[PDB]
Design an enzyme around this catalytic site. Structure first.
Site, PDB file in Angstrom:
ATOM      1  N   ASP A   1      -0.465   5.094   1.023  1.00 52.42           N
ATOM      2  CA  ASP A   1      -0.879   6.046   2.062  1.00 52.42           C
ATOM      3  C   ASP A   1      -0.857   5.401   3.435  1.00 52.42           C
ATOM      4  O   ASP A   1      -1.575   4.434   3.674  1.00 52.42           O
ATOM      5  CB  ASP A   1      -2.300   6.577   1.833  1.00 52.42           C
ATOM      6  CG  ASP A   1      -2.398   7.569   0.694  1.00 52.42           C
ATOM      7  OD1 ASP A   1      -1.592   8.537   0.663  1.00 52.42           O
ATOM      8  OD2 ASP A   1      -3.315   7.386  -0.145  1.00 52.42           O
TER       9      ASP A   1
ATOM     10  N   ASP B   1       0.864  -1.178   0.000  1.00 54.27           N
ATOM     11  CA  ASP B   1       0.000   0.000   0.000  1.00 54.27           C
ATOM     12  C   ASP B   1       0.902   1.228   0.000  1.00 54.27           C
ATOM     13  O   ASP B   1       2.083   1.095   0.315  1.00 54.27           O
ATOM     14  CB  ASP B   1      -0.867  -0.031   1.265  1.00 54.27           C
ATOM     15  CG  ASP B   1      -1.795   1.141   1.362  1.00 54.27           C
ATOM     16  OD1 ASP B   1      -2.534   1.368   0.371  1.00 54.27           O
ATOM     17  OD2 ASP B   1      -1.789   1.831   2.418  1.00 54.27           O
TER      18      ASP B   1
END
Ligand code: BEF
Ligand SMILES: [Mg+2]
Length: 273
Positions: free
Chosen positions: A27, A25
């Site tokens: 963020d 991922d």
């Protein structure tokens, strides 16, 4: 818990660089949640808070935020009841952004003057992975054009790095008209994973996987991998800690509470590579 984690890591060590790939991922996984006592921005926040967005629009985005965030963290609702509200949320935000008419040219300035920060140890992370040609698949529900500029300006957009996110769609003037492809949001990463089968089919030999996430939904990011011999899931638990600890503990292999570095991932890589 701990015996199993060690048996996974030993699997990874035995396979070496030759069998390894990273799925991660962006963020609040590669970027920080907070810094020196202030909250740090998501990709979306970088645009929300920049000079090329008016105050009234920033007001409206905050109105949306507190309407739909409240629904997102709502405990009673099953995730499928939440699914349309999340879809509704991302559409209106981009809708508000589209009306502002963002120039593609300005994106490099906006990121440059933002408060964004990558986690401690990111240089070592990306450089080691580039050195041994380890494929890195960054899979984000943020904004692709923003994300790319963060890692580019940080000097770590190496050739091994693939980015899949919500990319902007610009007109003949270089002014934003919408977003490309099908929306990637917090709860539907399983669909995006299967859509990128072309990528993963070329890495059949890379049967050892490390997955780094910060939400529950990030657990689905490896659903397109062709062959899984060993997978290790490292989860950053940055917020709603007391609510979600038990649950993260039961789904991620290693849970790191409010940890703003990549040093655990880096230490594990040092062993494998
Ligand atoms: F980039 Be992830 F979706 F937070
Ligand atoms: Mg995230």
């Amino acid at each position: 818990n701990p015996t199993r984690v060690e048996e996974i890591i030993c699997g990874l060590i035995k396979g070496g660089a030759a069998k390894l790939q990273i799925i991660t991922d962006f963020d609040m996984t590669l970027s920080r949640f907070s810094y020196k006592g202030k909250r740090c921005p998501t990709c979306h926040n970088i645009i929300d808070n920049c000079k090329l967005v008016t105050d009234e629009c920033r007001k409206k985005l905050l109105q949306l935020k507190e309407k739909y965030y409240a629904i997102e963290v709502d405990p009673v609702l099953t995730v499928e009841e939440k699914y349309p509200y999340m879809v509704e949320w991302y559409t209106k935000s981009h809708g508000l952004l589209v009306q502002q008419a963002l120039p593609k040219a300005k994106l490099k300035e906006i990121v440059a003057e933002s408060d964004v920060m990558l986690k401690e140890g990111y240089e070592n992370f990306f450089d080691k992975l580039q050195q041994h040609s380890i494929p890195v698949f960054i899979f984000s529900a943020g904004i692709g054009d923003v994300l790319e500029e963060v890692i580019r300006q940080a000097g770590v957009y190496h050739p091994n790095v693939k980015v899949v996110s919500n990319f902007m769609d610009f007109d003949e003037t270089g002014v934003l008209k919408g977003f490309k492809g099908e929306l990637i949001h917090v709860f539907n990463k399983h669909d995006g994973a299967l859509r990128n089968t072309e990528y993963f089919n070329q890495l059949k030999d890379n049967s050892n996987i490390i997955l780094l996430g910060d939400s529950q939904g990030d657990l689905r990011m490896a659903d397109g991998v062709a062959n899984v011999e060993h997978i290790l899931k490292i989860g950053y638990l940055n917020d709603r800690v007391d609510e979600l600890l038990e649950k993260y503990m039961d789904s991620y292999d290693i849970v790191l509470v409010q940890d703003e570095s990549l040093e655990v991932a880096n230490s594990i890589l040092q062993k494998i590579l």
